[PDB]
Amino acid sequence: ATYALASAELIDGKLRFDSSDGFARAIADGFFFVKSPSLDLAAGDTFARNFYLPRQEGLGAPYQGFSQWTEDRLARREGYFSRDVDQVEQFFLESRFWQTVFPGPLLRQAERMRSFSLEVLRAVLAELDLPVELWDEATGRCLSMQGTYHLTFNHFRSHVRARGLNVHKDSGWVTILRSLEPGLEVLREGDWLPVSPRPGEFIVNFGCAMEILTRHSATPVAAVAHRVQEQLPGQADRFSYALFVDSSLDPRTCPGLFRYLPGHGLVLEADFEMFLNEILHNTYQEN
Ligand SMILES: O=C(O)CCC(=O)C(=O)O
Ligand SMILES: [Fe+2]
């Protein structure tokens, strides 16, 4: 519970770690720190503290009242959610909705977070056993701006009596997490490792797609389980928000989940269109 994650700075398109073993620990730990490149985080910090409030007429109004943005106005699992089994009250939003839903300054912050997240992804791929010509297809066309990018906000309600948020692994490639306060814990060597945020840095982790891609290469990358500890009603309300990078979900753009096989190239391990054809037949037969 005292192990320190590796930490890097993004310089000239490569991750410069503060120790020589840093990249190797990062892909073994599944989590690592990256210095924020002087990003303006105020619009996101404001939204994180206001989206769930009722909207009034102050200067915070554009960041308030996002209970109006529910799934029926967006798509399923997008928008505002007050779930109760964990403390977390959330706002999920994929990039195609950003210009419509977010105020100007938050729109710009989300777009800069997305581009930063993709620079981090490219910097990781540069160190992996993965030929450069395969990067765009291997990672689901997220690098050519055809992927799925969520900015998600977490409001931890101290007055609610439950887990911060339950154990989960992320689905996609990289996640860039902005947080200021303790609570995050990650699974390392069987034990839960508390991770305290560092000022001016993001926390980065990998998702299942990244592990599927690399686990048969010379440089397997771990997607690691993580959770948030219950926040106490001794004046908590913790806040966080993260940019999730996922593959395109359109089989006509990304056929599914690849594995890289050294010497052989990319092999399609999950064929999205084939699976959708099977679901159609099951749905047809089931009724
Ligand atoms: O709030 C945190 O510290 C982590 C949040 C997280 O992992 C998530 O939103 O998926
Ligand atoms: Fe997560």
Numbering used by the authors: 5 to 291
Task: Please give sentences taken from the publication describing this entry.
Here we report the mechanism of three Fe(II)/α-ketoglutarate-dependent dioxygenases in bicyclomycin synthesis, which depicts the natural tactic to sequentially hydroxylate specific C−H bonds of similar substrates (cyclodipeptides). Three αKGDs (BcmE/BcmC/BcmG) catalyze site- and stereo-selective hydroxylation of inert C−H bonds in BCM’s (bicyclomycin) cyclic dipeptide scaffold, one of the simplest peptide derivatives without additional functional groups. Our hypothesis posits distinct regulatory mechanisms: BcmE employs steric hindrance, BcmC relies on inherent reactivity, while BcmG utilizes a directing group to control C–H hydroxylation. Although these three enzymes share only 35–42% amino acid identities, the overall structures are similar, and r.m.s.d. values are 0.70 Å (SsBcmE vs SsBcmC), 1.07 Å (SsBcmE vs PaBcmG) and 0.87 Å (SsBcmC vs PaBcmG), respectively.
We subsequently selected the homologous enzymes and finally obtained the crystals of the ternary complexes of PaBcmG (from Pseudomonas aeruginosa), which also catalyzed the conversion of substrate 3 to 4. As a result, we determined a collection of X-ray crystal structures including ternary complexes of SsBcmE, SsBcmC, PaBcmG (with Fe(II) or/and αKG). Likewise, the comparison between PaBcmG•FeII•αKG and PaBcmG•FeII•αKG•3 structures revealed that the C-terminal helix may function as a gate or lid for the active pocket, and the binding of substrate triggers the closure of this gate.
